[PDB]
Amino acid sequence: GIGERYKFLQEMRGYVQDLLECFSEKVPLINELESAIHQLYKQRASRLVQRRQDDIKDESSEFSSTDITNFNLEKDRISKESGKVFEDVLESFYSIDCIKSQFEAWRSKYYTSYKDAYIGLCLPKLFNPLIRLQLLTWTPLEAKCRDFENMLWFESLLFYGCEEREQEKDDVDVALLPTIVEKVILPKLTVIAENMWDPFSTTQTSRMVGITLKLINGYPSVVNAENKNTQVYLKALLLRMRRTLDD
């Protein structure tokens, strides 16, 4: 099986060589595209916080959409632009089910070699451009945004490693789900909450309490109250309100 793997690995290197040659230009662009939507959200946030506070001040003293549509058109443009900076790349480099199938077959042929060499830890790095690309403009609180269950990375991996055998603490697939959710999704969720969420929307606030509990209830082993990244996520949510009062 190493001889067939050697053939496969040499084919893989050429396959990845075209990807990385392309990526030499596209890796700076990932940072640029991520900055572009965040600055656009910053433009949205700076304009809307200033104007809506004046509206809320009048409304609160009483009791004591145009920009959003314009923003959505440019947000969709950046979303499509991000998918067009990666449209000139083969489907096999971004279809997560195709990638998963290769590594599952790799483990199915070389279980000992996959577990001992921690080959599964290469998956979050290969998915690192992919997860950042898919979660780029994503914010599940908006009226036209997809839920986290409606993405390739979550659905394919939701039962990955959830085998009927007793969960060993060092089983690479059993450890894959904590690693991707805690170390990749939660920092991304922190960046999303700090730079993209608009706390004044009551509807988003209703979704916020629901969606936070949903993640905790779906992964009580990982997304628990003791988890430092979950704590960082919970702390960031409160701090975003503070900054929203400062701006």
């Binding site: 050697y6 690995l9 990845v16 990385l20 990526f23």
Partner: peptide, 28 residues
């Protein structure tokens, strides 16, 4: 960037490991 060195390393490791597996086969 990391994928270039890491994936190619496995190719060079497999060529070495074939000699190592043969050495381990011979020893056993």
């Amino acid at each position: 960037p990391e994928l270039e060195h890491n994936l190619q390393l496995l190719i060079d490791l497999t060529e070495q490991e074939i000699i190592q597996n043969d050495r381990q086969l011979q020893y056993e």
